Design a binder for this molecule. Structure first.
Ligand SMILES: [O-]
Ligand SMILES: [Zn+2]
Length: 258
């Protein structure tokens, strides 16, 4: 009886094994654009992904992760609200069973069809495992997806999903360039928060971009063909792998833009 996204093991259950689920700095949240404070002291983000090395894609039973080589400062995030250098380790998505839901973060209560998370860790801590135990250990870049025109730079990801349909399957996935997933503008909201899956540790500086990317109906359809289950087990489609919005409690969301 492991955690997941079903009726009997889904987000409203997670607190029984992970009491931090009801913590003071849980994610995701609803971003209220009229209550977010413009902070002109925030710098622009610095995304240097030109030397990124992707290695592998895998279905871990809750999403698919594309993993990068994080043994050196090859794909890093700096600037914005961050002090120091944060290395890219993986990206993944959250999506819905229908186009009107899927995202974790909401914007004035609007849900998007999916949400991309580019996960980075603070190099001062040495490794990812040590970083998740610190309040400033991780920086996650969140990007909304809406259904419209195709995103060319995502097609390489959608084409391999057939080969990692079930839990535990992996495939080599080299020379993928994550710059093809970024919107034009890098304006953002930022707030202190948490991982949105167990162990739900409160180690994340969230950077959520204002501008969504567009993907095609056919592209996100291909995400919905993946499976939560392992081979030979009963088929359960990997859909609605998102956590609902949590209480903002005593936090302020800041915007890099007015
Ligand atoms: O996440
Ligand atoms: Zn995520």
């Amino acid at each position: 009886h492991h955690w997941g996204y079903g009726k009997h093991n889904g987000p409203e259950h997670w607190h029984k094994d992970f009491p931090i689920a009801k913590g003071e700095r849980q994610s995701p949240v609803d971003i209220d654009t009229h209550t977010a404070k413009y902070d002109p002291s925030l710098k622009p983000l610095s995304v240097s992904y030109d030397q990124a090395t992707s290695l592998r894609i895998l279905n871990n039973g809750h999403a698919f992760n594309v993993e990068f080589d994080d043994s050196q400062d090859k794909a890093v995030l700096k600037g914005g609200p961050l002090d120091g250098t944060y290395r890219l380790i993986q990206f993944h998505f959250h999506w819905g069973s229908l186009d009107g839901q899927g995202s974790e973060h909401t914007v004035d209560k609007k849900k998007y069809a999916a949400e991309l998370h580019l996960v980075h860790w603070n190099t001062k801590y040495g490794d990812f495992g040590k970083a998740v135990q610190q309040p400033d250990g991780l920086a996650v870049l969140g990007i909304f997806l809406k259904v419209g025109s195709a995103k060319p730079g995502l097609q390489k990801v959608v084409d391999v999903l057939d080969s990692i349909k079930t839990k535990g399957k992996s495939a080599d996935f080299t020379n993928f360039d994550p710059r093809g997933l970024l919107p034009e503008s890098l304006d953002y909201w930022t707030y202190p928060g948490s991982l949105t899956t167990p162990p739900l540790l409160e180690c994340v500086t969230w950077i959520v971009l204002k501008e969504p990317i567009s993907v095609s109906s056919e592209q996100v359809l291909k995400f919905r063909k993946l499976n939560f289950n392992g081979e030979g087990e009963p088929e359960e489609l990997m859909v609605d792998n998102w956590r609902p919005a949590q209480p903002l409690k005593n936090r302020q969301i800041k915007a890099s833009f007015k």
